[PDB]
Design an enzyme around this catalytic site. Structure first.
Site, PDB file in Angstrom:
ATOM      1  N   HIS A  19       0.807  -1.216   0.000  1.00 28.88           N
ATOM      2  CA  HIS A  19       0.000   0.000   0.000  1.00 28.88           C
ATOM      3  C   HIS A  19       0.842   1.269   0.000  1.00 28.88           C
ATOM      4  CE1 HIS A  19       0.910   0.356   4.243  1.00 28.88           C
ATOM      5  NE2 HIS A  19       0.140  -0.659   4.595  1.00 28.88           N
ATOM      6  N   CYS A  55       4.168   1.241   9.483  1.00 34.30           N
ATOM      7  CA  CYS A  55       4.023   0.173   8.500  1.00 34.30           C
ATOM      8  C   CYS A  55       5.384  -0.245   7.956  1.00 34.30           C
ATOM      9  CB  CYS A  55       3.106   0.621   7.365  1.00 34.30           C
ATOM     10  SG  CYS A  55       1.414   0.924   7.916  1.00 34.30           S
ATOM     11  N   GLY A 110       3.190   5.766  10.341  1.00 37.00           N
ATOM     12  CA  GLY A 110       4.573   5.627   9.940  1.00 37.00           C
ATOM     13  C   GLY A 110       5.208   4.306  10.319  1.00 37.00           C
TER      14      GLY A 110
END
Ligand SMILES: CNC(=O)c1cc(Br)cc([N+](=O)[O-])c1N[C@@H]1CCCC[C@@H]1NC(=O)c1cncc2ccccc12
Ligand SMILES: CNC(=O)c1cc(Br)cc([N+](=O)[O-])c1N[C@@H]1CCCC[C@@H]1NC(=O)c1cncc2ccccc12
Lengths: 306, 306
Positions: free
Chosen positions: B41, B145, B143
């Protein structure tokens, strides 16, 4: 979201752990530049420990009485000295992995990360608070002496703890990196015991602010309290007295949540008197006191879940 | 003595964390050899996320649509592919700090260490259990991920988790390092929610064995139980059913303490029915279920405090 007991990444410290052997004893050492730090009881036998004179024991050792192993490599000792309760060994090689570092003496209630090591090999990492009685509730077995506690600010490691011993109740005691013990403990086998402990009030309040930042307000009330009226309740429940310095420290967390510090103290007072009614706070059924205000700001969002 | 939620030393993983940027989005990636792994993503905008077609979004990108930063150094992307819910970026440089590693898919109830990272910089480390509903109770902000979970056996890192999202209740979901989600979750913005959870019975039993190893027997009783009679109580208190496989797993801990597994189940049954009477076990007022039998053997002494 979430809130966990969170340690600092340990990589900068891992590259500094070595093994130190003197005679039949092996423990961990901390290798920074051309110096290895370790507990001085590495030079003692089981009989020495009952009544050691470290000055007299150390004069009988030479530089080659000590073996230092960094991973696979043997480091040659070229000097040795005693600094309080630590042995300082000068070695022929500067550690290439030496980080930017400092030695600090932390105060009771403050937290640090612990890197548990055995035979010079890092084993695990967890977060500890220096209790008011100057012990830590660590997880340590035989061979863990020389393990270190640290904090990391940016790229600088602040070493604050070296492990020396476990007390009869199962808690742990040690020194700063100048070899001065935290608490009234000594490195000899005596009947010493940890004193009575108390709950870290400043940390409980910080943790209640974390709960509000993360979206939970169920424990608040419409009341306020004075410092003195809170401290009367604190005395009853074995909490540290709240001081004005502690009130000032909570300023930023009070500003982010809009809950005045003495209002949060009224909340805590009510929790102590009435219990928590089978509810939880940040997943806990008890009041946590091992998170400092700094730990909360480090981990929580800077925006409150209103 | 002692018993703490203990993470593996994180140094081997720290040397693999990078930053990955696509357009306006930045997140963390895992750099092993000449490949960087990150959530797919990263290529989506806020509008794409409501209904992304990742095949169609990715074909519109080139190798130079992606920026990889390893510390100070820029890494040049020379290839890219999608593997389930991960982006695989080939880079011009092999990571010199690549450890021996494996990719494993862990099972519910098993634990791992989490290295929380932001902007490619490791921030903190803590220990998590994969819940039966395939979420983890982590501590993550925007932040995070691309952060990874891992175990370490000897010198080999077994990566098992990459962080992708936070669900409405505040718990976290992600994939293995082949990009397959744990649980029925998908990387798009929908109304998905974590299913109902349950207590990890095998872990509670292991933790009770840890308490006995460390010297505490107050919760034992003179009774035994059958698998079926225990599972009737387990159903009532939302515990996972005990299986014979779980009984077999507890063999070594049963042998070290001399407490038969079904006798410890009788102890647990009594704890569930009567509560703990204001007592604690290994410092806890509740029954811990985030320690596996492996975690207990890893941390506890091999000799019981009898
Ligand atoms: C157990 N007893 C004491 O630890 C002890 C108690 C006193 Br009173 C004084 C000292 N003293 O002066 O050093 C002690 N350290 C021991 C003596 C020689 C130096 C290292 C010894 N300790 C460990 O190996 C150790 C550390 N941590 C957790 C452990 C868990 C199980 C077994 C051992 C440890
Ligand atoms: C919050 N909401 C979701 O996380 C979310 C929810 C769903 Br339903 C689906 C996705 N999805 O398909 O990716 C989600 N990830 C977001 C969408 C784009 C990718 C990254 C986004 N998440 C984070 O940055 C994030 C991660 N961890 C803890 C956080 C704590 C606070 C704020 C943000 C996070």
């Amino acid at each position: 979201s979430g809130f966990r007991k969170m340690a600092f990444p340990s990589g900068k410290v891992e590259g500094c752990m070595v093994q130190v052997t003197c005679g039949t004893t092996t423990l961990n050492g901390l290798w920074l530049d051309d110096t290895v730090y370790c507990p001085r009881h590495v030079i003692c036998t089981a009989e020495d420990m009952l009544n050691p004179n470290y000055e007299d024991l150390l004069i009988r050792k030479s530089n080659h009485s000590f073996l230092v192993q960094a991973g696979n490599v043997q480091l040659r000792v070229i000097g040795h000295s005693m600094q309080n309760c630590l042995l300082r060994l000068k070695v022929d090689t500067s550690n290439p992995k030496t980080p930017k570092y400092k030695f600090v003496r932390i105060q009771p209630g403050q937290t640090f990360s612990v890197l548990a090591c055995y035979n010079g090999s890092p084993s695990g990492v967890y977060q500890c608070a220096m209790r008011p009685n100057h012990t830590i509730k660590g997880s340590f077995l035989n061979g863990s002496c020389g393990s270190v506690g640290f904090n990391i600010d940016y790229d600088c490691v602040s070493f604050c703890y070296m492990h020396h011993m476990e007390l009869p109740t199962g808690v742990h005691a040690g020194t700063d990196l100048e070899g001065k013990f935290y608490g009234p403990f000594v490195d000899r086998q005596t009947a010493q015991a940890a004193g009575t402990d108390t709950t870290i009030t400043l940390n409980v309040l910080a943790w209640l602010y974390a709960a509000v930042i993360n979206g939970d307000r169920w424990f608040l009330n419409r009341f306020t309290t004075t410092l003195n009226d809170f401290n009367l309740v604190a005395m009853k429940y074995n909490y540290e007295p709240l001081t004005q310095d502690h009130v000032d420290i909570l300023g930023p967390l009070s500003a982010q949540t809009g809950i005045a510090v003495l209002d949060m103290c009224a909340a805590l007072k009510e929790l102590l008197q009435n219990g928590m009614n089978g509810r939880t706070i940040l997943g806990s059924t008890i009041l946590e006191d091992e998170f400092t205000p700094f730990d909360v700001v480090r981990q929580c969002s800077g925006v409150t879940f209103q």
